[PDB]
Structure 1
Amino acid sequence: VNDTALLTAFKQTSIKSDPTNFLGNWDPCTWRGVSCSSDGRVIGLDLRNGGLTGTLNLNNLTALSNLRSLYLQGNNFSSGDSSSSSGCSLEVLDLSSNSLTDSSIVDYVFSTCLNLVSVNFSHNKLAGKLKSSPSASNKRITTVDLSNNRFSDEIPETFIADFPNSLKHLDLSGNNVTGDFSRLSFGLCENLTVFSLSQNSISGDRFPVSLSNCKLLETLNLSRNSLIGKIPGDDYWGNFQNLRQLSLAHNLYSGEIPPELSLLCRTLEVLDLSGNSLTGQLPQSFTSCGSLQSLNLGNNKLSGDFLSTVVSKLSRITNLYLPFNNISGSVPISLTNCSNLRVLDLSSNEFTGEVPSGFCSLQSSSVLEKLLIANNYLSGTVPVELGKCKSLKTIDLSFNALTGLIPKEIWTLPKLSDLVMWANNLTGGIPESICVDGGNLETLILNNNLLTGSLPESISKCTNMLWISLSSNLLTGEIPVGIGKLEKLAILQLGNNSLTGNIPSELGNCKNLIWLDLNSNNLTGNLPGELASQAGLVMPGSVSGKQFAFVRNEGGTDCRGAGGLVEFEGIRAERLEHFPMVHSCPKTRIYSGMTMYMFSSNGSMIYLDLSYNAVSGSIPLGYGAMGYLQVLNLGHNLLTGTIPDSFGGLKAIGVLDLSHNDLQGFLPGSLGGLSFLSDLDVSNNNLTGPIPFGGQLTTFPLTRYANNSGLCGVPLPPCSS
């Protein structure tokens, strides 16, 4: 079994697709990826990020006697058959991003592969229970990563302790193991510096006593589990005098934050206690955390002036998150003594007074990049001093009591990318100098204000724009044709204003536009067929991964618009349930989550509301080819012609509203082939003929077809009579 004849046996037997042609040209040492040695033997195979699709069995590669490095990460390998039985010389194995399901691969590497130093099985589909530790005859293994798999059920009491004493890095995150944490043995845990059980289902009100034996621990991550009770205090955290990162976030801890946790402050760099039910405040003992950089205490019930009596004295703070707490009063001015502050999040608290801006007038230029104080009760005007924070990229003042104009100094911040200040009483307009003298923005979210004027053609200069929201303002003028230069724009909301003119044809050049809401304006002209000219070509983009809330208007056509999408970073849902904009419709529901595309390529527009305008002409035939379109509201216009038969192509549609127009002709039969059409309304037109018998049409209420010119068939009186 020659080495050159093994790799060829691997290529033919295991790999079933190589569109990169990066496994072609397959002497041993000249083959792509395989790094050889001087004496002609193969020692490593590096095929990372190759887009390879096949079935893997490690015995077919460990048969290579001198193979010590195997990199197969970033591919699409599946689990193979047991096959053959050979020794293993591997010192470094990486199988990070694949589709491996048979966890017997981990049993092999842990039983053989005795010289193994590091192995990464992460991000796969390895299933089953955790059983075997690395062999005791292995004296070298230092780092083992089994994170992000599908391992199930309990963890063996001595699973961690059974590891070789050389272990340094053990990561078990991203599974669904279970068990009382207190009954899990770490053993001697000598040399262990990094350990994570994050994102599992571990329970218990105690830590295992053996955990205290890990004197050299630098990272302890226990987040997103079900640990309960009080955070251990007294003397416990003195056991870990090297700990740089501790996370206990998103468990069920209660009580106050133990002052005794400050025995890590000699070395503690990162802390995450967020997502619990902690009260009181950060104890004064933490003034000694001269090394702390990231302090995350969000989503708890903390209160008091500990922001000034403690946090301001942390000379090296750079990332301070206390959103979703019970902190009242002014934002203390002393917080500016945090010279190195880059990200400050104080959203969803009870802060009053003025927007903090002192950070910008230090004796040194401020490095503050993100300022987030949404869902508070800040009053006054957007202070002009923020213009001196030249490193600002994200300003989130939404859902406050702000008033007055938006100073010119904000639109001139050189690196600004996100301007988020919806849900205030801000007045003024949009300068004609946006994004040209100021930063090229990604989000401009100022809906639910009192802004006046028109949207400048200068918006064409914001080529990076992903999301524009200016709904429910007092805007006027025409929609600028320059919007067409924004080929990364994904969401555009301008509803409930007084816009006039045509819907520009140039909107068709917005390559990534998936969400267009222009309801409740004064728009005229024809429907531009160019709106669908990107159907089947839309690519996703950087608008994914943003917090959003959707307010569904469940009142049919009487209620203006199909609903309301809002950027929802840092805002409690309750603050929205009491926003009178919600009660504008007698029936509402709050969908909530993170923006997520449902396609990888070749998509279409997702949400289209042009209702309540004065648009005339005929529905462009092309509109029906939008396969991912889930909402199409053209109600309350002056549309004429027939409903195109192409609408049988709206596979994804769930809400279709064409009511209150002057449409003629027949309902397309293909409407019955829409398996998700759950909200139809064609009432108040000149429609005639039978109601399609397919799909869900025969069940919609009589209200949805009424005030037409000869519709018949269930739910109406039958056509044959």
Structure 2
Amino acid sequence: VNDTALLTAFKQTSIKSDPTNFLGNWPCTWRGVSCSSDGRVIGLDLRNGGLTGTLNLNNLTALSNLRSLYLQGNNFSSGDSSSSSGCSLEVLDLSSNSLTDSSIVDYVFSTCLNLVSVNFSHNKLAGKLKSSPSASNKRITTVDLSNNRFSDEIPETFIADFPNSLKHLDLSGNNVTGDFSRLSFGLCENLTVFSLSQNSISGDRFPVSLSNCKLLETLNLSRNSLIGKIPGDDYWGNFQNLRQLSLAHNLYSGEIPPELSLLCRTLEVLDLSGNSLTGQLPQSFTSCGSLQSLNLGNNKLSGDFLSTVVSKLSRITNLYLPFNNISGSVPISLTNCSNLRVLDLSSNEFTGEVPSGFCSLQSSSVLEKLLIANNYLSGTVPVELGKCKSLKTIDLSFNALTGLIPKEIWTLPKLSDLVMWANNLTGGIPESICVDGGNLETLILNNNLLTGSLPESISKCTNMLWISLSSNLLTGEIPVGIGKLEKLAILQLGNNSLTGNIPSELGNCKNLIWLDLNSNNLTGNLPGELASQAGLVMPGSVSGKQFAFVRNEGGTDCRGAGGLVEFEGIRAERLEHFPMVHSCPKTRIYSGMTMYMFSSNGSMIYLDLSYNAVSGSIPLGYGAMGYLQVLNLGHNLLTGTIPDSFGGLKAIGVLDLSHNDLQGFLPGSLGGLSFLSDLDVSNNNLTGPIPFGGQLTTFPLTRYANNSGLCGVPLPPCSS
């Protein structure tokens, strides 16, 4: 069994697909294989090779001298059981694969006594935790079981049963359970990084052994169900080296113990967000000269501690306090934080004016992100913000601002996200956008009082992902240059007074997936190029953004098919009381993060053109939109017939064609539409039988009413 042969064996009895030809030259000359001088294999590096196969580690460990095995970033599944061979690995990397049989972990823990670092992260390893590395293993230092599918309670001695040289143990990203106080860390020597984050571990007390981890640098216990008070008193003196602590998204309550400031000699990161903490950051925390990231969001904190305490922290660079009860005016002492790059105070009870002193710092300010959404700020957008040349994101939405958008905002060089919807801002969009100022990714100013037209200059914002200007007082034509924005994914211009034709150039927007021009004054014909991207849409950087969708539940009497709104830093409760939510008698609020449902070769997703004066026939190409979930062409002057191609709108759930002048029959293929949950073809001149398949026979009468001779259930039968 020569080493040269085993790899070829592995290549034939494992690899199922090599679309990149990563092994075409297949001992030492081969790709990924590193050799020693004596002519023995000691390393196999096949990371990110797009390999599809079935890994059985015993066929690689047969190699006598193999100590390095990199298979991370592939599509390897788990193979048969062990053929009983000897292991010599020191480094093993099986990350980002499709392993499922966790026996591969029991084998590496039983054998592989020279194992230094192992990583199974981002696989599908299932089952309960059981085996810890062999006691004969005297070198293992880092072990990463994170982001798998492990289950059930953790063994009481699991962590403690690790060799004494362990330094880094990552168990985050599974669904293990258990009262945390019953878990033993043992003497917990040499341990510096430990994470149980993102599991279902309960516990109202910490285990006593944890206090033995005197060398701990990162303690991450976030996204569990730990309850009670944060351990105070002298407890945090055990961790004289702790640099990062996270107790976020647990069930902790009470005040933040002043004794937690024992970590302030070395603490660099604290995340206590997502609990039910009250009071303020105790004054004792002034000694945190090393703290860089303070995240206390989604709690119930209040008081003046931003000024009494946080302003005294010099190394602060990332400050998060959104979703709290902090009232009053924003403190100006926060400018004494000279190294502050990101600041988030959204969803508090702030009053007064926008903070601006950050920019007139004796030096240039490094502030890049300023977020104060869902507060009660008033006045105008300070022109002083134009001095913060490092600014990239500005979120002032859902305040009570008024006045114009200063020229100095639109010329901030690095600006990227300009977000101030749900205010009373006036003025227009400069003709000098993205030319003298930053090339934006998001321009979200819906529900304001802006006026004028949309500058043709918008064509210069080639990085644009999301435009929202709905419910303003805009006029003019939609500039044809919009078609140059090939990264533009979302475009909302509803509830304005726009005139002209729908530009054919919209079809050049390669990534456009959401188009809302409803309730304007547009004329002309439906451009056929709006579907010219069906089956070609690539996903893009617009994904991963907080949104909320308010579904108007009032048929066609309610204008538009709902409301999609950017929702960073905003409370749902504040939306459910927005009068535009009362615009429809009945509503439901969906919320989440923007996420494509196709990896490539997609189509448009949302199209609302209702309440205009567009005329002509429905372009047949519109039936090709396979991922289209909404099509609202209602309330126009459309003529002709409903294309039978509409039978290929497999993803559609809402289809509004009412209050037009459509003739002919309903395509029978609509019956094949398995997600069609809301159809309205009433108030046309449609005729003939209603398609007998799908949900079309169960809809209310009002969805077919006022036509010229429709028949069939739910209408009277056509034969009488």
Tell me how far apart the structure 1 counterparts of residues 55 and 669 of structure 2 sit (CA, whole Å).
46
Q: Report the CA distance between 1:323 and its aligned residue.
A: 0.2
Equivalent residue of 1:361, what SS? coil
Equivalent residue of 2:340, what SS? coil
Tell me how far apart the structure 2 counterparts of residues 702 and 282 of structure 1 sit (CA, whole Å).
60
2:183 alignment partner in structure 1: 184
Tell me how far apart the structure 2 counterparts of residues 409 and 22 of structure 1 sit (CA, whole Å).
53
Structure 1, unpaired ranges of 5+? none
Tell me how far apart the structure 1 counterparts of residues 116 and 151 of structure 2 sit (CA, whole Å).
26
2:587 alignment partner in structure 1: 588
Q: Report the CA distance between 1:85 and its aligned residue.
A: 1.0
1:112-170 deviations in whole A, cap 9, x for unaligned? 00110000000000000000100010100000000000000000000000000000000
Q: Report the CA distance between 1:587 and its aligned residue.
A: 1.1
Tell me how far apart the structure 1 counterparts of residues 224 and 611 of structure 2 sit (CA, whole Å).
48
1:289-320 deviations in whole A, cap 9, x for unaligned? 00000000000000000000000000100000
Q: Report the CA distance between 1:78 and its aligned residue.
A: 0.2
Equivalent residue of 1:238, what SS? helix
Tell me how far apart the structure 1 counterparts of residues 693 and 518 of structure 2 sit (CA, whole Å).
30
Tell me how far apart the structure 2 counterparts of residues 438 and 47 of structure 1 sit (CA, whole Å).
45
Equivalent residue of 2:581, what SS? helix
1:381-405 deviations in whole A, cap 9, x for unaligned? 0000000000000000000010000
Equivalent residue of 2:409, what SS? coil
1:546-598 deviations in whole A, cap 9, x for unaligned? 00000111101010000110000000000000000100011111010000000
1:463-503 deviations in whole A, cap 9, x for unaligned? 00000000000000000000000000000000000000000
Map 1:84-483 to 2 at 5 A: 84-483=83-482
Tell me how far apart the structure 1 counterparts of residues 99 and 141 of structure 2 sit (CA, whole Å).
23
Tell me how far apart the structure 1 counterparts of residues 285 and 40 of structure 2 sit (CA, whole Å).
57
Tell me how far apart the structure 1 counterparts of residues 711 and 212 of structure 2 sit (CA, whole Å).
80
1:612-668 deviations in whole A, cap 9, x for unaligned? 000000000000110000000000000000000000000000000000000000000
1:73-96 deviations in whole A, cap 9, x for unaligned? 000100000141111110000011
Tell me how far apart the structure 2 counterparts of residues 485 and 652 of structure 1 sit (CA, whole Å).
28
Equivalent residue of 1:608, what SS? strand
Tell me how far apart the structure 2 counterparts of residues 176 and 692 of structure 1 sit (CA, whole Å).
47
Q: Report the CA distance between 1:23 and its aligned residue.
A: 1.2
Q: Report the CA distance between 1:242 and its aligned residue.
A: 0.1
Tell me how far apart the structure 2 counterparts of residues 537 and 292 of structure 1 sit (CA, whole Å).
47
Tell me how far apart the structure 1 counterparts of residues 87 and 675 of structure 2 sit (CA, whole Å).
54
1:167-220 deviations in whole A, cap 9, x for unaligned? 000000000111000000000000000000000000111000000000000000
Equivalent residue of 1:152, what SS? strand
Tell me how far apart the structure 1 counterparts of residues 113 and 20 of structure 2 sit (CA, whole Å).
34
- When structure 1 is superposed on structure 2, of 169-178 and 81-90 the one drifting more is 81-90
1:15 partnered with 2:15: yes
Structure 2, unpaired ranges of 5+? none
Tell me how far apart the structure 2 counterparts of residues 717 and 121 of structure 1 sit (CA, whole Å).
64
Q: Report the CA distance between 1:344 and its aligned residue.
A: 0.1
Equivalent residue of 2:151, what SS? strand
1:659-705 deviations in whole A, cap 9, x for unaligned? 00000000000000000101000000010000000001110011000
Tell me how far apart the structure 2 counterparts of residues 591 and 292 of structure 1 sit (CA, whole Å).
37
Equivalent residue of 2:358, what SS? helix
Equivalent residue of 2:410, what SS? coil
Tell me how far apart the structure 1 counterparts of residues 111 and 616 of structure 2 sit (CA, whole Å).
74
TM-score (norm: length of structure 1)? 1.00
Tell me how far apart the structure 2 counterparts of residues 358 and 45 of structure 1 sit (CA, whole Å).
56
Equivalent residue of 2:5, what SS? helix
Tell me how far apart the structure 2 counterparts of residues 65 and 232 of structure 1 sit (CA, whole Å).
50
Q: Report the CA distance between 1:432 and its aligned residue.
A: 0.4
Tell me how far apart the structure 1 counterparts of residues 33 and 665 of structure 2 sit (CA, whole Å).
66
Q: Report the CA distance between 1:240 and its aligned residue.
A: 0.2
Tell me how far apart the structure 2 counterparts of residues 714 and 299 of structure 1 sit (CA, whole Å).
52
Tell me how far apart the structure 2 counterparts of residues 228 and 589 of structure 1 sit (CA, whole Å).
32
Equivalent residue of 1:410, what SS? helix
Tell me how far apart the structure 2 counterparts of residues 34 and 58 of structure 1 sit (CA, whole Å).
16
2:640 alignment partner in structure 1: 641
What fraction of aligned residue pairs are identical, expressed as a percent?
Answer: 100
Equivalent residue of 1:359, what SS? coil
Tell me how far apart the structure 2 counterparts of residues 256 and 72 of structure 1 sit (CA, whole Å).
47
Tell me how far apart the structure 2 counterparts of residues 94 and 466 of structure 1 sit (CA, whole Å).
36
Tell me how far apart the structure 1 counterparts of residues 20 and 113 of structure 2 sit (CA, whole Å).
34
Tell me how far apart the structure 1 counterparts of residues 454 and 577 of structure 2 sit (CA, whole Å).
29
Tell me how far apart the structure 2 counterparts of residues 357 and 11 of structure 1 sit (CA, whole Å).
62
Equivalent residue of 1:582, what SS? coil
1:312-363 deviations in whole A, cap 9, x for unaligned? 0001000000000000000000000000000000000000000001000000
Tell me how far apart the structure 2 counterparts of residues 344 and 614 of structure 1 sit (CA, whole Å).
45
Tell me how far apart the structure 2 counterparts of residues 437 and 279 of structure 1 sit (CA, whole Å).
46
Q: Report the CA distance between 1:52 and its aligned residue.
A: 0.5
Tell me how far apart the structure 2 counterparts of residues 641 and 365 of structure 1 sit (CA, whole Å).
62
Tell me how far apart the structure 2 counterparts of residues 173 and 205 of structure 1 sit (CA, whole Å).
19
Tell me how far apart the structure 1 counterparts of residues 204 and 622 of structure 2 sit (CA, whole Å).
58
Tell me how far apart the structure 1 counterparts of residues 632 and 569 of structure 2 sit (CA, whole Å).
30
Equivalent residue of 1:344, what SS? strand
Q: Report the CA distance between 1:22 and its aligned residue.
A: 1.0
Tell me how far apart the structure 1 counterparts of residues 426 and 308 of structure 2 sit (CA, whole Å).
36
CA RMSD of aligned residues (A): 0.4
2:33 alignment partner in structure 1: 34
Tell me how far apart the structure 1 counterparts of residues 372 and 630 of structure 2 sit (CA, whole Å).
33
Q: Report the CA distance between 1:375 and its aligned residue.
A: 0.2
TM-score (norm: length of structure 2)? 1.00
Tell me how far apart the structure 1 counterparts of residues 356 and 53 of structure 2 sit (CA, whole Å).
56
Tell me how far apart the structure 1 counterparts of residues 704 and 337 of structure 2 sit (CA, whole Å).
64
Tell me how far apart the structure 1 counterparts of residues 617 and 36 of structure 2 sit (CA, whole Å).
72
Tell me how far apart the structure 1 counterparts of residues 582 and 540 of structure 2 sit (CA, whole Å).
33
Tell me how far apart the structure 1 counterparts of residues 318 and 343 of structure 2 sit (CA, whole Å).
6
Tell me how far apart the structure 1 counterparts of residues 504 and 414 of structure 2 sit (CA, whole Å).
31
Tell me how far apart the structure 1 counterparts of residues 173 and 630 of structure 2 sit (CA, whole Å).
35
Tell me how far apart the structure 2 counterparts of residues 23 and 173 of structure 1 sit (CA, whole Å).
34
Q: Report the CA distance between 1:706 and its aligned residue.
A: 0.4
Equivalent residue of 2:639, what SS? coil
Q: Report the CA distance between 1:278 and its aligned residue.
A: 0.1
Equivalent residue of 1:617, what SS? strand
Tell me how far apart the structure 1 counterparts of residues 161 and 659 of structure 2 sit (CA, whole Å).
73
Count of residues paired in the alignment: 720
Equivalent residue of 1:419, what SS? strand
1:268-305 deviations in whole A, cap 9, x for unaligned? 00000000000000000000000000000000000000
1:490-530 deviations in whole A, cap 9, x for unaligned? 00000000000000000000000000000000000000000
